[PDB]
């Protein structure tokens, strides 16, 4: 129970429909490789779309990214408590949240339904989680690698994916076409014929 | 293997901020600044985890204060609009007499300020609609999803009306059953 947040401190200085805009972004990022085995933490600061200063756990301190962040690197790196904290984030924040989130993000599984039709055959796979998926086209038990073109992985925004993989077919009812999907939600390839 | 991102921003002079978490490109949750409440993207996540909402506002406050700081340091160099790339498709593949939802994807824009309407036959529709908050991109633009459940009919013709300062006029993405 109980999700964790990383904070920020003020940079160096002071405060405080066609009108010009100004945007500030902060991105606190946790990268996990092979579960929580190796983990990397980036405390990222943005003006408009530009990364001006960064804490990278693999470096151990703040470093200017552009000349804009130069004064923030010095400033923050002098708050020895701030650095101690950011250096713990890999464990107190990243590994923390991975553990709290694990069962319903990392371990979330939803079955793909793989329909097949034309409107060149569309084999369309919908509403699966997670994104990792393989979609193989088959021609009489032989994998057709050529004349296959695809939609890419499509992120629905609601924690489901969909992908359309179209195969070019010689327009005569010569033989059976098998579209076979593989996914971590399934224990055996889910195949789907058409002849 | 995995990425989790706490992504926030503050925007002048709209004075609007946002705080959310990203998992492999989906939103885990975001805090409703106005309502001071945590909104889980799927109802269930809140059964498994909690997040104390007022903390985000504290963050936003620092975001604000930095923005003010950066603005000056750049000599008030503002943001260059960057128009979106709409796209409309269907959740499941289409069928006649069978229910379905219409996803409108608004990609690669900035600042994160936009106006999305859903119409059918050139007339505004909003029954059952929904949207997500501005979401993060590795190039530091944003995405955003608007949702409209509906019913396959031959006669009906839908458009996702999308306006944004980088655009030079509103933007329509026609969609109809084929």
């Amino acid at each position, epitope marked *: 129970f109980s999700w964790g947040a990383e904070g920020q401190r003020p940079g160096f200085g002071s405060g405080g429909d066609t009108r010009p805009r100004f945007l500030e972004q902060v991105k606190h990022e946790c990268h996990f490789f092979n579960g929580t085995e190796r983990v990397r933490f980036l405390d990222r600061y943005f003006y408009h779309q530009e990364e001006y200063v960064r804490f990278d756990s693999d470096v151990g301190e703040y470093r200017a990214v552009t000349e804009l962040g130069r004064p923030d690197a010095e400033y923050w790196n002098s708050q020895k408590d701030l650095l101690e904290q950011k250096r713990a984030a890999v464990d107190t*924040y990243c590994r923390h949240n991975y553990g709290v989130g694990e069962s319903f993000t990392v371990q979330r599984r939803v079955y793909p339904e793989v329909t097949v039709y034309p409107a060149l055959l569309v084999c369309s796979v919908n509403g699966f989680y997670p994104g990792s998926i393989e979609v193989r086209w088959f021609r009489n038990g032989q994998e057709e690698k050529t004349g296959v073109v695809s939609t890419g992985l499509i992120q629905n925004g609601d924690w489901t994916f969909q992908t359309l993989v179209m195969l070019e077919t010689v327009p005569r009812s010569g033989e059976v076409y098998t579209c076979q999907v593989e996914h971590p939600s399934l224990t055996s390839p889910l195949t789907v014929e058409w002849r | 293997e995995h990425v989790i991102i706490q992504a926030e921003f503050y925007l002048n002079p709209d004075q609007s901020g946002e705080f959310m978490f990203d998992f492999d490109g989906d939103e885990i949750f975001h805090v409703d600044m106005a309502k001071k409440e945590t909104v889980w993207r799927l109802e269930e996540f809140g059964r498994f985890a909690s997040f104390e909402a007022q903390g985000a506002l504290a963050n936003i*406050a620092v975001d604000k204060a930095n923005l003010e700081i950066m603005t000056k340091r750049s000599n008030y160099t503002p943001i260059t609009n960057v128009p979106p790339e709409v796209t409309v498709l269907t959740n499941s593949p289409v069928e006649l007499r069978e229910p379905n939802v219409l996803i409108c994807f608004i990609d690669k824009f900035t600042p994160p300020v936009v106006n999305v309407t859903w119409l059918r036959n050139g007339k505004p529709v909003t029954t059952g609609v929904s949207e997500t908050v501005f979401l993060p991109r590795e190039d530091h633009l944003f995405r955003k999803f608007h949702y409209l459940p509906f019913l396959p009919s031959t006669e009906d013709v839908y458009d996702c009306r999308v306006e944004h300062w980088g655009l030079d006029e509103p933007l329509l993405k026609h969609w109809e059953f084929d």
Partner: T-cell receptor
Amino acid sequence: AKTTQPNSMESNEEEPVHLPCNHSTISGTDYIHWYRQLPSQGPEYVIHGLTSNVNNRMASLAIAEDRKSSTLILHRATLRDAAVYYCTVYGGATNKLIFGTGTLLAVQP
Amino acid sequence: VVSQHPSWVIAKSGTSVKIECRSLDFQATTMFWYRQFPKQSLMLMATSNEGSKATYEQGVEKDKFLINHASLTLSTLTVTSAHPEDSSFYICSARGGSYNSPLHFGNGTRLTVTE
């Protein structure tokens, strides 16, 4: 708020004192913090930690292996060490600092 | 460092008392307001995030106290309709950041109200 202390403790000067705190629901993203307050002043930071041991001049903090309790250790008590001692939690799950009822420590001359 | 002002305050009923909490040597993103009655503990009243409407803790009388946070260096508490029951110790703290940034306390303002 999420901590529990003995309301008061008695102790002799020149002896070390061990102030106990329970905090059995503390998140692994929050830290254990200790503050003390003299009779009419604001509270002041004494020490804080995450796990295991922490020490500074005159004062140490011993956190149990499971993080469900901790101890503030005063190595040698002076008469001026007599205060209210507050065990609090503060961190990544907890953005406000709430003081509980604390422990009222007397240092017998 | 953070300084409250004034340290000591005597006020007649129904007046209004103004306490200032200022962070001398840093930008305060959040100011907290605590008060403490005799024999009792510190209790949080309100949380102020710079350039925003303060949030009050439950059980806290909504209209009685007023925060004005406009500076990022200054926050101002105002007690309205001074009542003897508001004779208490009042403490503010400034935080230069959010999660895990240290609170810095004023040294308090001792308020007594007599009709």
